[PDB]
């Protein structure tokens, strides 16, 4: 039977079959040490007297699982047979231990494995709350809100975006509370199904995403000037948001920070206006990076027409957009999550490209 | 608290709160009958002294659930209070509103279930879902995660699977049968209402599906089905094979295998006799899957390119990863909308899509 590297612990003393790629080799003639890695990890394989193939060759190994604390995973497989399923023809450009090949590395592939877990958690939590996954070619998600009331979508925008839109809400506060629970689930999934990846990258886990600190774009805009000393301009900047991250981390010991009530001039014309110049919008800051942006939208046709004008743009151009809102579109809102940014900041990776398969 | 239409049967004699749209209405003087539609269904609502808003208005209803054998579902809500959350302005005529209908959205709800089943089965088989910017991309990821899948547009929704360390294309077809069984089962357990709503007939169980080589299929088409088939199976030919399969096997599914090397891409694993390790899946006479084992040996790939008079120099970027021991591997793609369409007996594939 084929056994994965992670389950070898339960097969000590038995003969098992491995399938994977030759991570590296140390040819000492009579005895030869191989490191085989499959999707679950790496294992030392001991053989001898063979004509060894090059690194990255696909192999099948049959052998005895033997205890050995010095070896990776405290295990070792003494090969009775080694079959090369697909020999590599050239030495790897770089010592894996050129994406098409370097992505095979454990640390290089790990962020993508964690991302898949986060997205799985994303869909599970929402499915359990009766959301319906949709597939579109902002308007489409609103139209679908009138069809399924609660919908979400996972698609590129180039970065992976996890969009959520729900109707029959009281205010933007419903969205924030939803995202908090959503995030908790996402992280839980990664922790349970991608634990090894998380530990391998040695990423330090964030603070629990519950009762996340709220902060008005006005209150935060001054904290930057009156307490931090950064020339905060028109709208928060990358550095401006980064400074707020540190602030919150020290103040409440939270890796997360909700920036609420943005100036109408900063948010689109569809953002539900507030009567104080603000809007029912919000941005989520995770360890200094904006990983979310959303808020309640405008559902009344009349209200849409007015705000469009207040933004110097001809309403005749938005006729095809205004249509649906002439059919009792219920109060609703939504937000989107930058999948890669979340993954990046969660795992303490250099840049966002490390959470993308082929940047 | 809010209670969905589908759950009213468990609240008879209680006060509940509904949220949804005004599907239909009719004023009868001091009392008026309404039909409220939410994401789970439609229920009759009785009100008094209420100025009825235009249809498609968003409402919040609060009232007593009462049994009424003459009402849809066998029950109704006698409203003590009705609030118009969002009044509709113009009367209803396009898509942005017609999709709200129970039958219109039903297919879309089924598809979401099919996809959930798809990811669940493969995830349980240790597959890693990936997100790429293409056949090459999936191939590359096989060298990374061994077994991967992707759900994305290609315009239509495509469900792609690609796995390494297989014995032959048969590993692919066996996995697709089990995958298909999980997808349908999921749709039945979480989208049963919409399936019955469309009065669809459930297909034969996706297991031990009949396998028929392209060559034999051709003989059967011309000799038994009286159809002038060519090197390429046409929609009509494929439809014909569908009937012949349900006749000889009673099966709604059919695997057509061993396609000629000439009608398949250069990366398809070839056989000596001139065919390939490929296969297409026909469901109700419609093609909903195509796939096969790929070439994993660099040299054989070069040979394949040349055999078709293709230039290797132009595929240097594609060929690189194959110098790094790609294992025997293969894959396939499922056309989500076609599956849904044929599963629910929908007229066109446009019905299984939100915005055509």
UniProtKB/Swiss-Prot annotation, chain B:
It catalyses: tRNA(Asx) + L-aspartate + ATP = L-aspartyl-tRNA(Asx) + AMP + diphosphate. Residues 135-138 are annotated as: Aspartate. The record marks 26, 44, 68, 76 as: Interaction with tRNA. InterPro entries: Aa-tRNA-synt_II (IPR004364), aa-tRNA-synth_II (IPR006195), aa-tRNA-synth_II/BPL/LPL (IPR045864), Asp-tRNA_synthase_2 (IPR004523), Asp/Asn-tRNA-synth_IIb (IPR002312), NA-bd_OB-fold (IPR012340), NA-bd_OB_tRNA (IPR004365). It is found in: Cytoplasm. ATP binds at residues 287, 335-338. Keywords: Aminoacyl-tRNA synthetase, ATP-binding, Cytoplasm, Ligase, Nucleotide-binding, Protein biosynthesis. Its EC number is 6.1.1.23. It holds the Pfam family tRNA-synt_2. L-aspartate binds at residues 290, 294. Its main location: cytoplasm. One of its GO terms (cellular component) is aminoacyl-tRNA synthetase multienzyme complex. Belongs to the class-II aminoacyl-tRNA synthetase family. Type 2 subfamily. Homodimer. Makes part of a ribonucleoprotein particle (RNP) called transamidosome that allows channelling of the aa-tRNA from non-discriminating aspartyl-tRNA synthetase active site to the GatCAB amidotransferase site. The transamidosome complex is formed by two GatCABs, one dimeric ND-AspRSs and two tRNAs(Asn) molecules. This is Aspartate--tRNA(Asp/Asn) ligase. It comes from Thermus thermophilus (strain ATCC 27634 / DSM 579 / HB8). The lineage of its organism: Bacteria, Thermotogati, Deinococcota, Deinococci, Thermales.
